[model samples]
Target: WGYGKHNGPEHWHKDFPIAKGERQSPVDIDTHTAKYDPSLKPLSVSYDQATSLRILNNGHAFNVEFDDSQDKAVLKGGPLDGTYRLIQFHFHWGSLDGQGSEHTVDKKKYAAELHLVHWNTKYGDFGKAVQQPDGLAGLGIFLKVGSAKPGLQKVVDVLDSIKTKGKSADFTNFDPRGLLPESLDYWTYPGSLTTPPLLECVTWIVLKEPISVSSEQVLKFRKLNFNGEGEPEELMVDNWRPAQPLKNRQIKASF
Candidate 1:
């Protein structure tokens, strides 16, 4: 929950009260108090016969849709089916110390992570259904540095393309499915978005294994332009909040 500078975690609360409504997504995943569910099984979101991309930007973040034409990312036989739209995807990363990630593993923090944000396409466009927490589904994955996290470099390279305000770049040749965890193993539980509005009822999925990037790749993130002005002025150096407590919610992990 840190900003540009001169702000403590406690200051975050004072600056913006109403812990529930405030845009507070701090990382303090209390492992000492967290439990494990051995029998937890993750839902499958297989990539069906797919091709092509659905990438776009809305000023806030440049979202690239992978295999949009394919009915990938499956859900239960309930109201949400493969009919849902894949929607958009953005990332969370550290600015200064190369830290501040939303999800955690074994109580360890990483440099960055990608959030493939999806909604019930059955209800039509994502914007129409975003106000409802049950309508949103987010897949969060940790990004380490080096050979282990290979796909992270793709995101870092594109920062320049969308570094300016109202600026966007299309990458039809790239596919985000590769960024997914190899085993697809994950931890699922209901939580809120770690951003503004802090909407709850979100189906949160945190992958078990983390991918790798290089120090140079992470450095690319540091060079990003926060606003349209770019470099030294109005640039977004880092835009990630620390983790938060599970808050009595049971974390379901699949082996």
Candidate 2:
């Protein structure tokens, strides 16, 4: 497991020195200070149902991979200057809720956070994009404790099929747009991935609104295993990185 007391987020700097850098992610979004960008275009998400591939539990989290071969799903507007192709989407959750989300606004934490990852087509591949400054973009949405989210139920049903690490199953024709919030209004900033390697090449776009999910639904996410088969039992819980320094970064808002 990459989440033991000796090898958790606090200790990631040992392997990745950039984890403690100035351009870190999961920052505390101070909405009052966010600069309004009237010129920021509305978000344009064009996703093709056929691009959906399969779901996988990579020990760290469950990622729903997509087929980005011909830009079937792409992000065209918003703060992004060029087109970005969708790659995958994943979530971060906690066992007993109080705080599960990686990014918080006004110090308020949600039950879970969804990250839709994308990469600039200008680069050869996702691997090459992550190494550049403006090569990656993440659209983050928060899930608050409330009524059951019907759209999420479809995804939740597949948890049992991929409970163990390295486990994957065919999951097709599912659109990632169903998980998005109603309002596209968001805060944009320059940050890094909230996981290992912590590459400082991500452009974060966190939504203002939150979707609904029940407590029972959140439990399913925790049931996932961080350890692989033939290994000791260890539940995947509290997989979130704490907020880091904002430093000289500016958070622009798209109203």
Reference-based TM-score of each model: 0.76, 0.97
Candidate 2 wrong stretches, greater than 4 Å: none
lDDT of each residue in 1-255, candidate 2, tens digit only: 276787888899989999889899989999898999998989988875437789999999999999988788888799898889889999999777888899989899998999999999999699999989999999999999888888788789999999999999999888777787889889999999999889999999999999999878887998999989779978989888889999999999996
Per-prediction backbone clash count? 13, 0
lDDT of 1 at 39: 54
lDDT leader:
2
Query: Candidate 1's residue-wise lDDT over 1-255, tens digit each?
Result: 434465533345554453444222433444444456665544556544333353443333456765543355533322234445555677666764347466766567788878866676655666665666566677777887766345555656776776665666666555566777676666666666666445563676677677776678777666655555443554454566656655555655554
In model 2, which range of ten residues has the least summed lDDT? 44-53
- Estimate every model's Cα lDDT from 0 to 1: 0.59, 0.89
Off by over 4 Å in 1: 5-39, 48-62, 65-84, 96-98, 148-154, 230-235
